[PDB]
Design a protein around this ligand. Sequence first.
Ligand SMILES: [Zn+2]
Length: 204
Amino acid sequence: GTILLDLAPEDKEYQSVEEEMQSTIREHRDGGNAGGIFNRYNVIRIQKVVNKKLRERFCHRQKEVSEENHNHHNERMLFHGSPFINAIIHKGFDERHAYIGGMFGAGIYFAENSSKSNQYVYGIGGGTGCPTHKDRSCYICHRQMLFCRVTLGKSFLQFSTMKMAHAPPGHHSVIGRPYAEYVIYRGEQAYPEYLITYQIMKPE
Ligand SMILES: [Zn+2]
């Protein structure tokens, strides 16, 4: 099944993941309501998700996609926040949890900004925050997010709300602009490469 492999802080791979996370923090339109108020994270663990079965499913789909995107699977590293991170790392992403709704339909959504994914760690709009304090801006409780390999193939650009069930004909993903939201409609188009444990930090 799934094995979690810790990365050591001295490892350039750990450093690369933390740098992508810290450097993509931005101020959000909701004034910090969903994800909290912070300028940086305290990254306290980075694990690689190792699952031969899940990896085989992802590579098999990459091969299907490359054939339709002129030998390119167009992979991007993107963040994903979710209260269901335990199911994802054990069973993989699953589009069946995505229903006709959402700004860009029944897909799984990813962000270039780690702070955007941090808004979804405790639910839509941050839910009711952490389980212990019910605080969307909790500095105590440890959070987790994923940094994923996402097979985008041929992306379709969308600039208004729609409720698509699948990507348009001949396409494999939707890049939606309400900052871009990257949407796939098959769970096997994302691999949960890194599981990051972190806190948001109080501003100084
Ligand atoms: Zn808390």
